[PDB]
Amino acid sequence: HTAPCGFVVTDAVEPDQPIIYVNTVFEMVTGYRAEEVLGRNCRFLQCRGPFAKRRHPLVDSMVVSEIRKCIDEGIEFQGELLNFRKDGSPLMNRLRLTPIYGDDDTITHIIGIQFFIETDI
Amino acid sequence: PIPYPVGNLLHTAPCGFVVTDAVEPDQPIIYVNTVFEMVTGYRAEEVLGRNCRFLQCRGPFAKRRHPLVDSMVVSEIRKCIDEGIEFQGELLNFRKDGSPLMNRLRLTPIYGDDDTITHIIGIQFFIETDIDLGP
Numbered sequence: 001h002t003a004p005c006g007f008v009v010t011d012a013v014e015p016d017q018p019i020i021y022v023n024t025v026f027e028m029v030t031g032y033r034a035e036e037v038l039g040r041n042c043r044f045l046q047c048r049g050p051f052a053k054r055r056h057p058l059v060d061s062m063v064v065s066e067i068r069k070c071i072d073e074g075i076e077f078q079g080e081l082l083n084f085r086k087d088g089s090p091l092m093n094r095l096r097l098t099p100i101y102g103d104d105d106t107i108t109h110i111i112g113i114q115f116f117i118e119t120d121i
Numbered sequence: 122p123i124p125y126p127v128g129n130l131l132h133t134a135p136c137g138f139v140v141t142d143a144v145e146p147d148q149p150i151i152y153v154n155t156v157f158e159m160v161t162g163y164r165a166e167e168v169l170g171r172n173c174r175f176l177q178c179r180g181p182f183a184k185r186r187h188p189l190v191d192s193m194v195v196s197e198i199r200k201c202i203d204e205g206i207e208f209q210g211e212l213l214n215f216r217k218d219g220s221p222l223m224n225r226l227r228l229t230p231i232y233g234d235d236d237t238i239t240h241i242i243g244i245q246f247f248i249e250t251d252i253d254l255g256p
């Protein structure tokens with residue numbers, strides 16, 4: 001009786017798309033809790049757990065770039081990206097980004113939909 | 122150690138979420154979140170397996186879309202879905218109790234393997250409206 005995917009909402013107004021909301025699937029799958037992720041950028045998912053301070057090299061920088069262009073140009077994104085759980089275990093993340101236009105025909109929010117796939121060592 | 126519960130900030134969820142199955146006929150709902158349940162007044166078990174268009178009816182005992190919801194917007198939505206593209210717009214909906222809801226709806230398709238659409242995601246921002254069908 002559960003969502004098939006993670007949901008993430010960021011604030012497109014504040015600098016660098018802070019997370020204002022994640023759903024329970026996001027929390028259960030990634031091992032992070034809403035409280036520790038709120039206010040941060042989603043790119044911590046590309047670092048191998050919370051004590052890796054650099055993007056992991058197997059994270060496809062071409063896709064990360066496309067994601068950046070898409071957010072900046074206020075358009076849709078779909079792609080796939082290595083991410084990692086809080087415990088460092090890898091995760092394939094089939095990600096969809098979609099902007100929300102507000103009253104001013106301005107982007108207020110971005111929705112991320114995460115269809116997580118499974119593992120390897 | 123003692124576990125840490127999931128979902129401590131549901132009450133901070135800014136929008137409804139709906140997921141439909143794009144493969145079954147007529148986009149049946151396979152999931153709705155708790156903001157949807159709370160705002161629309163319809164609870165998950167009653168809406169699963171149906172098409173979202175029931176929200177255009179004034180409550181649960183009206184079979185057809187209310188004449189006040191924009192037939193032009195409804196049409197653009199249909200087009201967008203069937204054309205496998207995204208949609209954003211504003212639609213009159215109704216809570217279970219019959220009261221007007223203004224639904225700022227964004228629809229995005231989820232392509233699977235096969236570069237074929239497996240799901241559509243609906244994000245509902247319920248905004249303010251002056252629409253008021255009197256007492």
Ligand SMILES: Cc1cc2nc3c(=O)[nH]c(=O)nc-3n(C[C@H](O)[C@H](O)[C@H](O)COP(=O)(O)O)c2cc1C
Pocket residue numbers: 008009010017041042043045046064065067068071081082083093095097110111112114
């Ligand atoms: C709503 C939203 C959800 C996102 N979800 C993810 C995610 O689940 N995994 C991920 O690796 N990046 C995700 N991102 C992307 C990063 O936050 C960031 O935009 C990306 O790493 C490119 O930016 P950068 O080059 O500054 O790192 C998301 C972005 C937004 C706006």
Ligand SMILES: Cc1cc2nc3c(=O)[nH]c(=O)nc-3n(C[C@H](O)[C@H](O)[C@H](O)COP(=O)(O)O)c2cc1C
Pocket residue numbers: 139140141148172173174176177195196198199202212213214224226228241242243244245
């Ligand atoms: C994922 C998804 C979510 C939807 N959410 C809503 C909604 O919240 N309110 C609404 O009035 N229609 C919603 N719809 C639209 C209707 O289900 C339907 O597509 C629309 O009325 C146009 O088609 P029709 O003229 O055949 O009814 C949603 C559609 C999809 C695919």
